[PDB]
């Protein structure tokens, strides 16, 4: 009979378990025997308090480095403002020690936990790459609660070294099974930011995780976009509870908040899942998340049923992670087929955008070729366009099965005249659909202004396989 943790703050970790069902169903995974033993998670952040009384027992120097000062020790830099507390808070969510009379517990409270000190300084492309590519045959899961500015006017993503680190990680990392990169989808809700304008969350190589409040609502800071894959609980209003974790200076906090708290909880659940089947590939893990995540009682006005019967929202992806379902489904999972990539150049000539532009194209998805895809994973619309005020644009993509993905919603603060330069807008919402057939791209001016521009390139990039489908939900 499984005995739940006795830690003093465990009863306040409402998101881990409860009679109420507003939780991540983590105790169910613990009771199946999965607590994270043998899995290694690294927090890419501003450092980790490696001697914290609730982290020391799980701390792994092999999962750690200090990229900012070029040494092995990721200890945070202590200041009066406690600026560098952020990574320690994230680490305790994953792997705070259980049953030791201190604070609460991590989701994967027997996993090994490290940190890369890389945010406390100028975060260059090289800094990111050295962090994302740290010890990739030892670290299984990387958690990143950071990214480009959430001002609602930035379009930015990994530069060359960081993108090379992503491809090296998913291709050769973890013994060729692929590093697992977990990303917080963003805090730009108040600025009406879109997480598709963030190349880290928008990457197919990251599991981008959004947030829900305790009462099941879209938090004020949440960013909506089609690249988000799933959701974990985090903070909301001041009547809703927050996240309990390890704090700087060997303290315990019950007020960890924002998108920053959601990615580590997902990383911990993924750690439990990897313990249940260490042979899972980076793509396997995304399939598991898609199949097991739960929309129920998450409130959003944009819930839609996709072509294979799954509910999907731009605020939540496929819904809340469900640790018990993840670990159960993982145990007998059959490895997915190798990933195929079908490139379809859509345009035969540039197209003036004007007030509204619709581009329709019927595709065969590489029929007859070795990269034929009948079972979609990620899809990208790689767009090159000029426009006089970028944030007035709304962009939608409709799949042959009728699933309408918002690639870009209006961003009131984005005044840029720089347009999009082969920007790979990504959607998860057509996962497992057959991509053969008519795709529709819609670009529209959401303002009354007389805006102007031209779409010069639209590449539809399909990823997926040609085997192994489930009967639709």
């Amino acid at each position: 009979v499984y005995q739940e943790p006795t830690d003093p703050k465990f009863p306040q970790q409402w998101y881990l378990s409860g009679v109420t069902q507003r939780d991540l169903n983590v105790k169910a995974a613990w009771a199946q025997g999965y607590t994270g033993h043998g899995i290694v998670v690294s927090i890419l952040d501003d450092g980790i308090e490696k001697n914290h009384p609730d982290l020391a027992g799980n701390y792994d120097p092999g999962a750690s480095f200090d990229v900012n000062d070029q040494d092995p020790d990721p200890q945070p830099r202590y200041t009066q403002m406690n600026d560098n507390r952020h990574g320690t808070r994230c680490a305790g969510e994953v792997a705070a020690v259980a049953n030791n009379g201190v604070c609460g517990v991590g989701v994967a409270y027997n996993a090994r936990i490290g940190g890369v000190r890389m945010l406390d300084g100028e975060v260059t492309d090289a800094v990111e790459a050295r962090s994302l590519g740290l010890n990739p045959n030892h670290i299984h899961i990387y958690s990143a609660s950071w990214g480009p500015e959430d001002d609602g006017k930035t379009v930015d993503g990994p530069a060359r070294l960081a993108e090379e680190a992503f491809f090296r990680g998913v291709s050769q990392g973890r013994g060729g099974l692929g590093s697992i990169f977990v990303w917080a989808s963003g805090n730009g809700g108040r600025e009406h930011d879109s997480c598709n304008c963030d190349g880290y969350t928008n990457s197919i190589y990251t599991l981008s995780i959004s947030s829900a409040t305790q009462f099941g609502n879209v938090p004020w800071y949440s960013e909506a976009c089609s690249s988000t894959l799933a959701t974990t609980y985090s903070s909301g209003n001041q009547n809703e509870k927050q996240i309990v974790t390890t704090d700087l200076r060997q303290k315990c906090t019950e007020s960890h908040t924002g998108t920053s708290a959601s990615a580590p909880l997902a990383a911990g659940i993924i750690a439990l899942t990897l313990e249940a089947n260490k042979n899972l590939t980076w793509r396997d893990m995304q399939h598991l998340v898609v199949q097991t995540s739960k929309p129920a009682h998450l409130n959003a006005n944009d819930w839609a049923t996709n072509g294979v019967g799954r509910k999907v929202s731009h605020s939540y992806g496929y819904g809340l992670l469900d640790a018990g379902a993840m670990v159960a489904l993982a145990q007998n999972w059959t490895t997915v087929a190798p990933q195929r990539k079908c490139i379809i150049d859509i345009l035969t000539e540039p197209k003036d955008i004007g007030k509204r532009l619709e581009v329709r194209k019927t595709v065969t998805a590489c029929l007859g070729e070795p990269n034929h895809i009948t079972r979609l994973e990620h899809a990208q619309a790689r767009l090159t366009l000029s426009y006089n005020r970028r944030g007035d644009l709304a962009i939608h993509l409709v799949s042959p099965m009728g699933t309408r993905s918002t690639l870009l919603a209006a961003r009131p603060h984005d005044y840029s005249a720089d347009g999009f330069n082969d920007w790979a807008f990504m959607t998860t919402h057509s996962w497992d659909e057959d991509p053969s057939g008519e795709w529709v791209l819609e670009i529209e001016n959401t303002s009354e202004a007389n805006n102007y521009g031209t779409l010069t390139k639209f590449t539809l990039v399909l990823y997926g396989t040609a085997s192994g489908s489930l009967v639709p939900r």
Binding site: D46, V123, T124, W146, P148, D150
Partner: peptide, 4 residues
């Protein structure tokens, strides 16, 4: 360039 990058933010917590």
């Amino acid at each position: 360039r990058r933010k917590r």
